Design a protein around this ligand. Structure first.
Ligand SMILES: CC(C)(C)C(=O)N[C@@H](C(=O)NO)c1ccc(-n2cccn2)cc1
Ligand SMILES: [Zn+2]
Length: 889
């Protein structure tokens, strides 16, 4: 088990200037001929020439056209090719090889592999070494000349990086295409696609240089009609980078390709972007609403990789957050601008405070720039990506738009055509910071702690108001809990976007203000404050922290009703819920522990319920926001606030609170569900694939959320509404009818009905599987077994496997069954999956990430299953390391 350390970075003793590839695809094998035009670097010390090379079958290797022999001149152990230094030349030389690989049986979906009837590659982070020998690290920049050959009937469309410079026929019904890509690039950006691909195309003319750019979106013939939205999103992405950042696309063509078998969302490769089909393809008849925001963000994400990727490459993989955090941040800016709905930002905050906060207090906790790794495939985390983006976002919050866009330009210019680090980015933003403060002594050295320090900071508040002085004070304290990464946590640079709300008319009292907290504690004072304000803190969620506002529920309700900032309204609601949840939880827990025959529960705040009704009945209020306030905080958000969480007791707590609110607002819920129908289910643009209305989709979200609440509560004759819902042409609607019908006898009837609607579309069926998997059924285990035997079977498609099992793991009452049957089931699935796809196996370990936060019995059950998984003789390095770190072993 080798461990790479960030402090151990040293440049290669070798140089690769030119790569010349010949990839010959055949029925039962793929032959890869490679010539590497190499040289000796200034850091060389006469060491052995060591190439990365995993699972390569050597036909022959050479240096300067002379064949090398095994044992005397080189050794190969299926991981590293070692050529002894005495046989390594002193100056410019040519290394060549011919290996055999097998994309057909490559079920790990890394390197070159076959997805249905498409040959496709995935080289990030260390996948290129699975195709041919190379010094597989991102700082090895080279030129690429790639030739691909295959059977024309099976693979008429051949794609790779750069320009297609030659097409030719080959005896035996075969053909070739040659691609030349002159600009330097790292090997993880290499890509190749072969298949019977159909496409939609368009020409984009750039804003400034008026350059014409060919846009292509590819898929298998069956789903070519689902390519339209992707093309529109690409156009949107190009326009946005031109209008906001003032950047145009550098190349003359851009290809997007959908494949059915993909480990993640998508991949950026210079001009050739490859996507999980579920993140590129959609139609209104065959997709749920979520696909449309999903495709927008993922297409945007891969597009925004281009500009920066063309000018600055990572020095090493420890700087991953520099390219991913920044791109997710640009992606988020894009999406917020495109959707023009406040729930877009809210959803990102929702995901961070649930999934990433869990990770950051788990034994897997790490900084966005880690100090070490064993497997790079476990490096791509919500911390690196989503906390990373929040850290990138805070630069904009501190600097403002003008000085941010300015510090961004400094970063590009200063690091053009070379490898950079996170500190290079901080340095550039520091130059903008000095200029903003108009004092050249200003610095952002403390800000670097955001990169090196793990864990989520806690920010708490106390207040004072002097009526006679008209003086208002905000006392702020920050704290980060020590962990395995740092014994002593340092104070961070925390930007606190604030406003002060006049409680008697709801007006803003002060201008836009961002408090800069740089110490463990500070007191911020405001003069000329005519009345006691209600503080609106961390507007837009301006720092990735735990917020302890120390407000009363009455104060929180007034923010919820009258504040101008969506997040603070949403957070105020969240805080009211959390206070109620913790109170009722402890009450239920005491009853259980003391075996009480009778006990009391604290009712939900009546004024809070009044506030919800007020907002729901406001026709000028946002439908998306409304769906958030009638929903309790996510379980994974809640668990960060409870020690030794009894999942049954939490389930009882949620049930009580939902019923409390339902017993008061169910009539309002029903009235709204009916009145929203017209606008939410409007069919005017149902056959226009380029017309996407995010507000309308939010209305459907509200309706489906309300329907769920009404179905659970068994509202009189709601089954009628459920049945009529199933007849809706919108998949979001008729899949909702399935899940909410779980509380009725008509469930298995809609099960069959929605299955027939879903089975002839690959992606739609996967959404059906998800819906079934997440269904609130008492017989969910028998239902899962049915899915395995009748639909899923022995599929190795990651989308299929994730769809069947992951939603079920969110079933608080059932997955966490006290017998451990749920833990045992998922562990069996992880072990089975690990045999062919280690990455997806690790993804399936997701529910275990909170193992040490549960009650003692459930802790023991999960730990038992993880130790059982760890003792599998054939366990992958990926899963092994992941479980070793998670179990603190
Ligand atoms: C959907 C999302 C934006 C999270 C995504 O697909 N991200 C890509 C990415 O950065 N594309 O440019 C991504 C996610 C995980 C990996 N990865 C995970 C393990 C090894 N690589 C690679 C790429
Ligand atoms: Zn990315």
């Amino acid at each position: 088990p080798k461990i790479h350390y960030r402090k151990d970075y040293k440049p290669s003793g070798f140089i690769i200037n030119q790569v010349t590839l010949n990839i010959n695809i055949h029925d039962q094998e793929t032959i890869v001929r490679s010539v590497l035009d190499m040289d000796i670097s200034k850091h060389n010390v006469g060491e052995d020439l060591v190439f990365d090379g995993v699972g390569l079958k050597i036909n022959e290797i050479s240096i300067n056209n002379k064949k090398l022999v095994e044992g005397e001149e080189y050794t190969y152990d299926n991981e590293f090719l070692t050529i002894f230094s005495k046989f390594v030349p002193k100056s410019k030389f040519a290394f060549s090889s011919e290996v055999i690989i097998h994309p057909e049986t490559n079920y790990a979906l890394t390197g070159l592999y076959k997805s249905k009837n498409i040959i496709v590659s995935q080289c990030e982070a260390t996948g290129f070494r699975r195709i041919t020998f190379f010094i597989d690290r991102p700082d090895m920049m080279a030129k690429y000349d790639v030739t691909v050959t295959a059977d024309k009937e099976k693979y008429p469309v051949l794609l790779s990086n750069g320009d297609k410079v030659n097409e030719f026929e080959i005896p035996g019904g075969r053909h070739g295409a040659r691609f030349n890509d002159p600009p330097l690039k790292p090997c993880y950006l290499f890509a190749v696609v072969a298949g019977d691909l159909k496409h939609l195309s368009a020409t984009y003319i750039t804003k400034y240089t008026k350059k014409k750019v060919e846009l292509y979106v590819f898929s298998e013939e069956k789903y070519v009609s689902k390519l339209q939205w992707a093309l529109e999103c690409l156009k949107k992405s190009m326009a946005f980078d031109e209008d906001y950042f003032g950047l145009e696309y550098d190349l003359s063509r851009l290809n997007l390709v959908a494949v059915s078998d993909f480990n993640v969302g998508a991949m950026e490769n210079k001009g050739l972007n490859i996507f999980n089909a579920n993140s590129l393809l959609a139609s209104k008849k065959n997709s749920i609403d979520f696909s449309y925001a999903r495709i927008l963000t993922v297409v945007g994400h891969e597009y925004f990789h281009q500009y920066t990727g063309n000018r600055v490459t990572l020095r090493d993989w420890f700087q991953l957050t520099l390219k991913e955090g920044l791109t997710v941040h640009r992606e988020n800016l894009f999406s917020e601008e495109m959707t023009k709905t406040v729930t877009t930002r809210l959803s990102h905050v929702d995901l961070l405070r649930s999934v990433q906060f869990l990770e950051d207090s788990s034994p897997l906790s790490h900084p966005i720039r880690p100090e070490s790794y064993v497997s790079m495939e476990n490096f791509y985390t919500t911390t690196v990506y989503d906390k990373g983006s929040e850290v990138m976002r805070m630069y904009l919050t501190i600097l403002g738009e003008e000085y941010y866009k300015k510090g961004f330009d400094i970063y590009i210019k200063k690091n053009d055509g070379n490898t950079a680090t996170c500190e290079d980015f901080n340095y550039a933003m520091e130059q903008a910071y000095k200029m903003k403060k108009a004092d050249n002594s200003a610095n952002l050295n403390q800000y670097l702690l955001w990169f090196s320090q793990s864990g989520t900071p806690h920010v708490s508040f106390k207040y004072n108001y002097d009526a006679e002085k008209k003086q208002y004070s905000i006392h702020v304290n920050q704290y980060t809990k020590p962990d395995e990464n740092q014994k002593e946590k340092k104070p961070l640079f925390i930007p606190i976007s604030v406003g002060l709300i006049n409680p008697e008319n709801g007006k803003e009292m002060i201008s836009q203000t961002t408090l800069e907290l740089t110490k463990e504690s500070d007191t911020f004072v405001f003069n000329n404050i005519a009345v006691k304000p209600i503080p609106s803190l961390f507007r837009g969620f301006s720092a990735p922290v735990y917020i302890e506002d120390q407000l009363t529920d009455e104060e929180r309700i007034l923010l919820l009703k009258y504040d101008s900032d969506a997040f603070v309204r949403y957070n105020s609601c969240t805080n009211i819920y959390m206070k109620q949840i913790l109170m009722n939880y402890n009450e239920f827990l005491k009853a259980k522990n003391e075996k009480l025959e009778s006990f009391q529960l604290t009712p939900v705040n009546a004024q809070f319920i009044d506030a919800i009704k007020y907002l729901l009945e406001d026709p000028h209020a946002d439908a998306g926001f409304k769906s958030y306030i009638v929903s309790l905080p996510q379980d994974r958000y809640i668990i960060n606030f409870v020690s030794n969480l009894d999942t049954d007791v939490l389930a009882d707590t949620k049930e009580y609170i939902y019923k409390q609110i339902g017993d008061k607002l169910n009539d309002v819920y029903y009235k709204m569900f009916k009145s929203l129908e017209a606008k939410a289910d409007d069919l005017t643009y149902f056959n226009d694939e380029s017309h996407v209305d995010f507000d309308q989709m939010n209305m459907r979200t509200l309706r489906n959320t309300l329907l769920s609440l009404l179905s659970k509560a068994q509202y009189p004759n709601i089954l009628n509404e459920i049945i009529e819902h199933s007849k809706s042409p919108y998949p979001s609607n008729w899949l909702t009818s399935l899940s909410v019908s779980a509380y009725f006898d008509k469930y298995f009837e809609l099960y069959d009905k929605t299955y027939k609607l879903s089975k002839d579309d690959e992606l739609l069926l996967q959404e059906w599987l998800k819906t079934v998997s997440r269904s609130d059924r008492k017989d969910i285990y028998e239902i899962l077994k049915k899915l395995e035997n009748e639909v899923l079977k022995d599929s190795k498609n990651p989308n299929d496997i994730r769809a069947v099992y992951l939603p079920f793991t969110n079933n608080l009452r059932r997955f966490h069954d006290i017998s451990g049957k749920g833990y045992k089931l998922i562990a069996e699935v992880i072990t089975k999956t690990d045999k062919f796809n280690p990455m997806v196996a690790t993804q399936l370990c997701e529910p275990f990430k909170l193992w040490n936060k549960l009650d003692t019995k459930r802790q023991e059950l999960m730990l038992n299953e993880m130790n059982t998984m760890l003792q599998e003789p054939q366990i992958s390095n990926n899963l092994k390391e992941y479980l070793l770190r998670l179990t603190n072993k």
